Design a protein around this ligand. Structure first.
Ligand SMILES: Nc1ncnc2c1ncn2[C@@H]1O[C@H](COP(=O)(O)OP(=O)(O)O)[C@@H](O)[C@H]1O
Ligand SMILES: Nc1ncnc2c1ncn2[C@@H]1O[C@H](COP(=O)(O)OP(=O)(O)O)[C@@H](O)[C@H]1O
Ligand SMILES: Nc1ncnc2c1ncn2[C@@H]1O[C@H](COP(=O)(O)OP(=O)(O)O)[C@@H](O)[C@H]1O
Ligand SMILES: [Mg+2]
Ligand SMILES: [Mg+2]
Lengths: 578, 51, 470, 315, 193, 158, 193
């Protein structure tokens, strides 16, 4: 394959001559040390290659070898319980042979090449094979990993290895045309994997946090964004989504950020426990970690690796949740790379194609029918960090145009220790009108009609905020005091949630529905009593008010009897009072 | 009256002035880097006449 | 040994050399003219035809007939030893104190390899800087990167000297008493003038702080590539000491604004297209390669802590230098000009200051257990005091309630005693005693943030102890 | 007709590639680019000279090489095959079916850039349209032959308004007596950078109304190549003009999110380093937008009419 | 060429109260009417075409809508000339170059219109010239200069824009023609910032 | 501005009886340099100088709006050359009026942009300070001579 | 060359109340006074030349008007030196380079003035050096860099401008001369944004 020599060195830009026949965006090996780089421009006998790591110490005349393939990941068994950087290099095995630093030109393999797996063939010779079907199964933790053929491969099965212990390198199925199929295959990170058909987002993706899945729901295969400042819950809400959602496999992608912030999540994650099995949470997640001082190419290509791995796990029939943390850093890396290519800037120094890249990243989410006939979905949640809370940045404007949900955080509620601290007058969801037929069948008939009651009750105090800062709350008329108090108990029992509690960290949908029904019963009967000229002070002292506070901490199995008893007590209280 | 006037009238005009000045400065910076991008190409084209 | 004599072009800070394909990229060279004078230089381009050398110092006297270029070294390296403690260097390793040069145990490349993210561990111990506003409310943690934001006329240099003179570790507060730990300070000055140089020279030697410090001093009129090279050499020495001799080091970077300006000038000299507001497009990565060299490593006893100092150009926090620093560092300490004009030193403003690693360093077993709630209460009380003082000027003192007058007096007493410590050295216990004495002027039960157990244990002391030495 | 191939590629960078000996390529021609793996890419000639010719690629340039890539001519002017059987079909934005049905049989081939209408040949639009919205019908009324965009926001429901307008529009001939019957509109729908969520809503609304049997859809999803976003509205307007002025149809054209079209144009303008405008957009955006908008109206002596409702989002 | 230029001393009646009373323009002067989209430049110019007391009216639709040019062709052959019994179109000359017509032809239309207006001046008539938009002419100059690889001054505009605009507005005025008669040309030009 | 300039040229005189210099007054000689002036302003200036009777003492350099642009490079220099000659050779008191420096600056910017010079603020050439200095700095009073040169430039602020 | 730099500990008295009381400058220090046109920069510097207690005053006129130097030549011989009783001009050296004088000489005037000031430092005197405008030096550097066709930074200034400005200001200070005496040079430089 194509080999050449260095002609000119100027910073990270290397010009190699004798490169006639190389292809654009291929990966090369630059110099004797083994540095890697992409070809960005071809001209006659030369080829412009940009090196990822620094080029100090290189000399003119050192060989340049092109691999002949673009940037790609290795997809196969052994990716769970792993930690990778932006270009799928396992950090744990890098540590074992290098130390506390990362030397240049290190060569490691993404998948372990010497571990035995329990192969079980699901095919026999003579069978027709097309792209996307299953050859066999391999057990892996609590999952039965399926060995798929590449989407470009079709033929007829010739020989099949019997069941036994094999490595990922051993060929297991050979076709009639001589093609050898192993336990793994490679796929470029910038090309989307094919599907049969993309379905409709008619099922909800359950978070486990009350306010999100009640007021601003996100459907399965949908896209959401969560901006905010520091100490605003960005990190805790994501790791609660990782534990409590109905997703099978979780992918956490961390773009280039602070080193100690990376150390926090690298240390606390092995401690977390999977609620479904009681084992470690590490057994079902894949981590991508990048610090601010690692090469900019890895930081830019970090999210593509994660979304390709998520697509690979989608193709096997699972439901995958992908968490992009601080996409503003990815935009910064893209800006730096575009600056190194002397492109003309637009807006705040960003390249003109920022919106195209953001769209091309977000559209890989969705619920599909896989090539093998199974169903799967990928859900993407992306964090955004504004520089000073300004929503006019190009990144947030480009994200707003494409996401289906927008969970705005604010530090004003975090100052009151009110968590989750999302703003419920700034957030919006677009999946509400499509989830209603599922809602009125699976939860309860009145739920879409009941949600509007909570929304209007919360809205009516926002129209009373112009009088409360002028006149004290106690001086209000009882007809407005009722609205203020019921909205207050809504804010302090339904909207707030303790993520560290044993039973408050997860709430099913019928529990929340019962809470809203019970709050409406309280408000309606209280308004009826107020119509009879009674003081509102006796209403605030009612014993049912503590029944309202205690509804959060009841067990999921224990809830219905408590709900019925609260319904009986609240029916007895108000028309016993004259 | 003073609180409502300061909230409704004074602040939005100031903010619009901020936005307008920011846009003007950014546009001038873009015009200024275009000339440098042309001049570098002219420099590269100059020293290629007979190598 | 070999010399190249094919110079074909001289203009400004660049010169071209023919048939120099054996020179590695980024190497250091020596330039000699007809009079025997020697200048330095660095290779910035290597090609089949010619190599481009960027020249230290002015190019006066050079000519195309008598100039020759010889190689010094392929990669910039620094010779390190434990004997560097108590020595002063010019920014490229050459001594300036007149002492004989040190004998190197090792020669390390000045550019540092990145730390493996799985090899780090969470910071868990604090450093006593001796300043009450920093120790109590913006605590510095071993392994943190906590920059200081200052204006133009503000005394950033004196604060840096005081911190370098007073900082120490406190193993007696941790656990069973721990065990004695070595400590050292690495000081880096970039773009300083003669007056600041003399001030630092007298300050570090008049009190014995030189015996545990290494000084890298770069003048304003020195060649600007040395200004780029200086902080990397400082961090190389710090990393060597910390991770091969279990030292606890503290690195002070005197002015990052000069570094950024020098980076801009170098980028303009090599014909690069600038980015936002004329600054290079890769400033974020370049600053990340400096800041992210600090931290603490699993399985090791040492630690590296950084306190960068930068002067905001026009008090504009949206400027690129403050903006890119905020994306990488853990909080900031902001000096206030209004406090500086009123005679208060050090003028550290507690309200916009923040330390993001406070929660993991304070607490029981590593300091006194009442630290966090006391700091929160002090912040919340000062926030009310500074606004009540503004309302007084309109509605008068009589129209307030009693507790508002207590807050108004509390703010004045706070500014008079807590912040204005002067040149005194305060331990953490003395600072906490002063903090509890200041909170004593508020009535009991107004302290909402503090639990009853600490209130019953510490409340009630008079302020007359610190009144003997304000 | 015989085919000709050029193999003298000399320079590749970004969307542009240079062909050396291509002297007989017409300015504006459409070429087919083939690499060693057999994949075929499209392109358009944008500058032709004695020394070389400059070709921009309709998609990414990954995989191309100077040794095995060859450029073959297709046609001198970009043309689209139009027919009356295209009603009820779906296309990918470059003229290829997506629904899986066999391709249509062209009646004529027409240039996609069109031709300007003679101002003498026009006539005044005069027929009032009752849309069913009081804020539109009374105070901003719509006339057959008008171009009337909707200035949407970031999260505002403009798509629902467009669907409701298309569902209820009628001409009300009884108020004037200038005809009878209930002659319905044909609908041409062009989407540029649309996502799956809005595409699903549009498809279900069109199938529920039953108007999908008399509509033509050109769909360019948000993950499709960006240069295809330029060509998509031109072919939709070509189909609308052909139907209206050769078969007496009354067509209605809906263009979705032309902000995406403007960013698509800005990307190419930045790649071609041409002189920018007010916010980095190219200085010729007015002319390009005019070549799209000014293809509507009515023509004297003919019964057909073209109506456009563009949709755009104010940043 | 002319013999001499004279000082304007008679009003140019437009029929609009605010323009004729508060901000008058004389016979032989120049005026500019800038405004954003939807302000009413075209209605104001077509009203000036309909109701002004000029003998011959020249309308130059430089780079604007084609429907606005069809409205003139339809309405005018029915209306009545203010100062004679004939149809209004018998005194009007139209030069049309719409937006989707070729860009380079925008520059020539302005010169053609002003040359025709100057020709009718030499016969002893009073001529009114209305330019529909000059920003389109500026954009045509910008595109030609972009093709010429010239260095732009501001906003991409060539540095010689102010010379061309000055040369265009100079041609207006009240003169004594070479034949000894008297004539005048007044120019009203719209701007689209 | 033109009316104010005409009024100044009409009414300006020294006051020997207050300063005590004793010399009886004589009128100024006017040098008029117009760059890109329109007919509307030119006719006003001509009529004002006709009515005040100052045309017998004045030299006029006219560059009208339709005249070629590059001619504006030369006009101020020759106007000031004539003013310097008269004042410092024949002891006249010369008053110089320049109608629009903005039209001179546009003419300078055109040549600067055609020559690919490095621009300053807002696209104007970087050497505009020196070029404007070579024009303004030709006024003043010389020791041992009776003449003097006074300049009143007029410019429009954009 | 010098023997040893010293720490400044003696004030430089100017006669201005606000500058002497609120913003003092030491004997070997440096100061800058920027401002827009008409702010008072030059009058402040001429008052400093008139009333300060320095032994020798050096005035460098980099690019200002010529009347500002005519005033010094006319007025100064008539005044009285505060600390010796003789004429004020006997202690003053003027370097003049007016606006209309050639551009390339602007750079040389600053260096000539600072070299003369350093020469008078070595004899045991205390010298005050004043630059009328240091922005014109930057403009001259930009003008020459325009001809050299090298790529500029930000506002068109050459990249090495900061090094030149730093090397100019660091010549000040209180020193021990090679002859064993003590001298001092203080620099005040105006900036014209
Ligand atoms: N739902 C919650 N329950 C309890 N504490 C929370 C919750 N959300 C946020 N917090 C608190 O907010 C602090 C900051 O966490 P977070 O804002 O998620 O990370 P970051 O500050 O990096 O964005 C945490 O210390 C945590 O105690
Ligand atoms: N004098 C007027 N009387 C009534 N309506 C007017 C008048 N001037 C403008 N308009 C209104 O302005 C609208 C369009 O103005 P237009 O002439 O298109 O401005 P522009 O051409 O600058 O966009 C017309 O629909 C018309 O109703
Ligand atoms: N200390 C002062 N006392 C009185 N007038 C002053 C003083 N300083 C400045 N001025 C006035 O301000 C004007 C500033 O002029 P000058 O300093 O020569 O120009 P520039 O500051 O633009 O170089 C002078 O005409 C002078 O009359
Ligand atoms: Mg109009
Ligand atoms: Mg001055």
């Amino acid at each position: 394959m194509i080999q050449g020599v260095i002609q000119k060195i100027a910073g990270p830009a290397v010009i190699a001559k004798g490169m006639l026949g190389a292809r654009m965006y291929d990966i090369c090996k630059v110099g004797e040390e083994g540095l890697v780089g992409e070809i960005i421009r071809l001209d006659g006998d030369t080829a412009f290659v940009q090196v990822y790591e620094d080029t100090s110490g290189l000399k003119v005349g050192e060989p340049v070898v092109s691999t002949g393939l673009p940037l790609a990941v290795e997809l196969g068994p052994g990716m769970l319980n792993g930690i990778y950087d932006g270009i799928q290099r396992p950090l744990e095995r890098i540590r074992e042979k290098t130390g506390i630093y990362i030397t240049r030109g290190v060569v490691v393999h993404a998948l372990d090449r010497e571990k035995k797996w329990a192969w079980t063939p699901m095919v026999k010779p003579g069978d027709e094979v097309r792209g996307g079907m299953v050859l066999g199964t391999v057990p892996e933790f609590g999952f039965t990993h399926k060995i798929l053929v590449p989407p470009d491969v079709r033929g007829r099965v010739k020989e099949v290895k019997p069941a036994g212990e094999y490595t990922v390198e051993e060929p297991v199925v050979v076709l009639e045309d001589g093609t050898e199929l192993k336990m793994y295959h490679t796929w470029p990170v910038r090309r989307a994997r094919p599907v049969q058909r993309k379905l409709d987002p008619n099922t909800p993706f359950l978070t486990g946090m009350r306010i999100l899945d009640v007021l601003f729901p996100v459907a399965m295969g949908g896209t959401a964004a969560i901006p905010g400042p520091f100490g605003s819950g960005k990190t805790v809400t994501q790791q609660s989504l990782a534990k409590w959602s109905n997703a099978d496999v979780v992918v956490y992608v961390g773009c280039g950020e602070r080193g100690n912030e990376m150390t926090d999540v690298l240390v606390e994650f092995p401690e977390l426990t999977d609620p479904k099995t009681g084992g470690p949470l590490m057994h079902r997640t894949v981590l991508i970690a990048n610090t601010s001082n690692m090469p900019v190419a890895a930081r830019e290509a970090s999210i593509y690796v994660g979304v390709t791995i998520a697509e690979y796990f989608r193709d096997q029939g699972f439901s995958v949740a992908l968490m992009a943390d601080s996409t503003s850093r990815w935009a910064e890396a893209l800006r730096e790379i575009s600056s190194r290519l002397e492109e003309m800037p637009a807006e705040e120094g960003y390249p003109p194609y920022l919106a195209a890249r953001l769209a091309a990243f977000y559209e890989r989410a969705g619920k599909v029918i896989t090539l093998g006939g199974e169903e799967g979905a990928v859900t993407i949640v992306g964090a955004v960090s504004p520089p000073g809370g300004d929503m006019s940045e190009p990144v947030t404007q480009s994200t707003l145009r494409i996401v289906g949900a927008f969970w705005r955080l604010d530090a004003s509620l975090a100052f009151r220790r009110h968590f989750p601290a999302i703003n419920w007058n700034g957030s919006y969801s677009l999946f509400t009108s499509a989830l209603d037929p599922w809602y009125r069948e699976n939860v309860a008939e009145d739920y879409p009609e009941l949600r509007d009651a909570i929304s209007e009750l919360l809205q009516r105090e926002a129209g009373l905020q112009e009088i409360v800062q002028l006149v004290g709350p106690d001086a209000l008329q009882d007809a407005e005091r009722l609205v203020i108090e019921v909205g207050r108990i809504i804010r302090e029992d339904f909207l707030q949630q303790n993520a560290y509690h044993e039973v408050d960290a997860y709430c099913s949908m019928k529990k929340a529905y019962g809470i809203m029904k019970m709050i409406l019963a309280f408000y309606k009967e209280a308004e009826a009593a107020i119509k009879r000229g009674v003081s509102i002070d006796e209403i605030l002292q009612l014993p049912v008010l503590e029944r309202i506070g205690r509804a959060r901490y009841v067990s999921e199995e224990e809830f219905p009897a408590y709900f019925e008893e609260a319904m009986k007590e609240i029916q007895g209280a108000f028309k016993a009072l004259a | 009256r003073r609180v409502n006037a300061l909230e409704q009238v004074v602040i939005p005009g100031i903010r619009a002035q901020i936005r307008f000045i920011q846009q003007v400065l950014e546009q001038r910076e873009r015009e200024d880097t275009f000339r440098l991008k042309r001049i570098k190409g002219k420099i590269e084209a100059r020293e290629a006449e007979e190598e | 040994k070999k010399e190249y004599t094919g110079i074909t072009y001289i203009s400004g800070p660049l010169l071209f050399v023919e048939n120099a394909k054996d020179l590695a990229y980024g190497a250091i060279v020596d330039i000699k003219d007809g009079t025997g004078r020697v200048r330095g230089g660095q290779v910035i381009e290597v090609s089949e035809e010619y190599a481009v050398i960027q020249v230290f110092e002015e190019t006066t006297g050079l000519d195309l007939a008598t100039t020759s270029v010889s190689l010094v070294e392929d990669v910039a390296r620094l010779g390190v030893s434990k004997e560097m403690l108590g020595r002063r260097f010019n920014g490229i390793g050459k001594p300036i104190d007149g002492l004989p040069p040190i004998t190197p145990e090792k020669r390390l490349p000045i550019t540092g390899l990145p730390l493996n993210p799985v090899a780090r561990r969470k910071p868990e111990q604090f450093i006593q800087t001796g300043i009450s506003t920093i120790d109590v409310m913006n605590t510095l943690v071993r392994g943190q990167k906590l920059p200081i934001f200052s204006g133009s006329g503000l005394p950033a240099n004196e604060i840096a000297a005081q911190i370098a003179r007073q900082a120490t570790v406190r193993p007696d507060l941790s656990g069973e008493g721990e065990k004695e730990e070595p400590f050292a300070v690495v000081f880096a000055a970039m773009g300083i003038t003669q007056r600041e140089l003399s001030y630092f020279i007298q300050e570090f030697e008049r009190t014995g702080a030189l015996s545990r410090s290494v000084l890298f001093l770069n003048k304003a009129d020195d060649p600007t590539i040395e200004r780029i090279l200086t902080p990397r050499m400082a961090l190389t020495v710090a990393e060597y000491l910390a991770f091969e001799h279990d030292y606890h080091v503290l690195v002070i970077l005197t002015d990052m604004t000069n570094y950024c300006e020098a980076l801009r000038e170098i980028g303009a000299a090599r014909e690069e297209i600038p980015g936002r507001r004329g600054y290079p497009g890769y400033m974020y990565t370049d600053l990340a390669t400096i800041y992210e060299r600090a931290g603490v490593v699993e399985g090791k006893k040492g630690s590296v802590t950084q306190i960068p100092i930068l002067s905001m150009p026009d008090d504009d926090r949206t400027h690129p230098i403050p903006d890119l620093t905020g994306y990488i560092t853990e909080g900031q300490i902001q000096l206030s000009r209004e406090l500086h004009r009123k005679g208060i030193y050090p003028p550290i403003d507690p309200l916009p200051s923040l330390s993001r690693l406070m929660n993991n360093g304070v607490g029981k077993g590593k300091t006194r257990e009442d630290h966090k709630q006391v700091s929160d209460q002090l912040y919340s009380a000062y926030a009310n005091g500074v606004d009540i003082r503004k309302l007084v000027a309109i509605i008068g003192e009589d129209a307030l309630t009693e507790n508002d007058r207590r807050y108004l007096q509390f703010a004045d007493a706070f500014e008079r005693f807590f912040i204005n410590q002067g040149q005194q050295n305060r331990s953490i216990e003395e600072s906490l005693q002063i903090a509890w004495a200041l909170l004593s002027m508020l009535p009991q039960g107004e302290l909402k943030r503090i639990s009853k157990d600490h209130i019953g244990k510490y409340y009630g002391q008079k302020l007359e102890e610190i009144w003997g030495a304000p | 007709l015989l085919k000709k191939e050029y193999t003298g590629i000399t320079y590749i960078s970004g969307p542009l590639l240079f062909v050396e000996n291509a002297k007989d390529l017409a300015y504006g021609a459409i070429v087919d680019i083939k690499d060693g793996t057999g994949r075929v890419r499209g392109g358009q000639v944008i500058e032709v000279s004695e020394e070389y010719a400059v070709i921009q690629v309709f998609e990414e340039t990954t995989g191309l090489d100077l040794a095995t890539t060859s450029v073959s001519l297709v046609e001198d002017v970009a043309r689209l095959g139009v027919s009356k059987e295209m009603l009820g079909r779906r296309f990918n934005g470059i003229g290829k079916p997506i629904d899986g049905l066999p391709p249509i049989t062209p009646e004529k081939r027409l240039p996609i850039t069109g031709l300007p209408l003679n101002p003498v040949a026009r006539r005044k639009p005069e027929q009032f349209i009752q849309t069913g919205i009081s804020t539109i019908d009374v105070m901003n009324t719509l006339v057959r032959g008008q171009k009337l965009p909707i200035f949407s926001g970031s999260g505002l429901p403009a798509n629902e308004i467009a669907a409701q307008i298309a569902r209820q529009a009628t001409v009300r001939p009884d108020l004037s007596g200038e005809g009878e019957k209930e002659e319905p509109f044909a609908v041409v729908f062009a989407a540029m950078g649309i996502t799956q969520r809005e595409l699903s809503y549009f498809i279900q609304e069109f199938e529920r109304t039953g108007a999908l049997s008399r509509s033509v859809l050109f769909l360019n999803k948000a993950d499709d190549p960006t240069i295809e976003r330029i060509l998509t509205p031109r072919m939709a307007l070509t189909v609308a003009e052909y139907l209206a002025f050769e078969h007496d149809y009354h067509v209605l054209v809906i263009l979705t999110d032309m902000t995406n079209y403007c960013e698509a144009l800005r990307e190419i303008g930045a790649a071609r380093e041409e002189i920018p405008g007010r916010r980095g957009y190219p200085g010729y955006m007015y002319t390009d937008l005019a070549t799209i908008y000014e293809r509507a109206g009515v023509v004297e002596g003919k019964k057909g009419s073209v109506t456009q409702i563009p949709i755009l989002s104010m940043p």
